Amino acid sequence: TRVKRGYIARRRRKKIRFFASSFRGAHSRLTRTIAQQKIRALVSAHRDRDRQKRDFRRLWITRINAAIRERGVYYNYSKFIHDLYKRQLLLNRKILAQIAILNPNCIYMIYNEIIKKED
C-alpha cells in the first residue's frame, strides 16, 4: 500500500516556522536554516535561564554596595553583610536591593540598627 508522505512533513515544518518568526533575514524564511536557528534559540534560552539567576545576584549586590557606601566613610558591602549576619537578620539580596531603591530611608534605618547593636 503506497504512502505519499503528504502533510506530515509540512505540518512539522510549519510548527517550526512559527517559532522562528521575527528572525532577521533568511533565518525567518528557509526551512533548513530555520531548523538550526530554532535549536540555537532554544539552547540559549536554556543557558540563560541559568545565567539569569547569576546576573541578578550580580546586580543586586552591586546596587547594595552603592546604597551603603554613602553612609560611613569606611563602610562596604562586605562589612554590611557580615554585620547583617552577626545580628541575625534573614533579608536576602533582592529585598535589600529593592528596598535600597524604592524605600531608601528604610535602608538607612537598618544600617542604624546594625550600628546601634555593634555599639
Partner RNA sequence: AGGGUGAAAAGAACCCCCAUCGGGGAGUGAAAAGAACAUGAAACCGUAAGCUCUCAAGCAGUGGGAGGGGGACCAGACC
Partner RNA sequence: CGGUAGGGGAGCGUUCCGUGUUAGGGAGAAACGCGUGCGUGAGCCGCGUUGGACGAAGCGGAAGCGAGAAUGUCGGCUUG
The binding site for RNA (CB under 7 A) comprises 1-3, 5-15, 18, 23-27, 29-33, 35-37, 39-41, 44-45, 47-49, 51-52, 55
DSSP assigned state of 26: G
- Cβ-Cβ contacts under 8 Å for 53 (sequence gap 6 or more): none
* Interatomic CA distance for residues 83 and 113, integer angstroms: 10
Give the cell for residue 112: 542604624
Minimum CB–partner distance for residue 109 and RNA (Å): 26
Quick check: 49 and 62 in contact, CB under 8 A?
no
Taking the C-alpha atoms of residue 26 and residue 24, their distance in angstroms, rounded to an integer, is 7
| Binding-residue pattern over the window 15 to 34 for Mg ion, x denoting contact by CB under 5 A | -------x------------
CB of 79 to Mg ion, least distance (A): 20
Give the per-residue contact string, 18-47, with other proteins (x = CB under 8 A; - = no).
Answer: -------xx------------x--xx-xx-
How many amino acids of this chain bind other proteins (CB under 8 A)?
44
Task: Give the CA distances from residue 102 to residues 6, 69, 95, in Å, rounded to whole numbers and listed in that order.
Answer: 59, 17, 10
Binding site for other proteins (CB under 8 A): 25-26, 39, 42-43, 45-46, 49, 56, 59-60, 62-63, 66-67, 69-70, 73, 82, 85-92, 94-95, 97-106, 108-110, 112-113
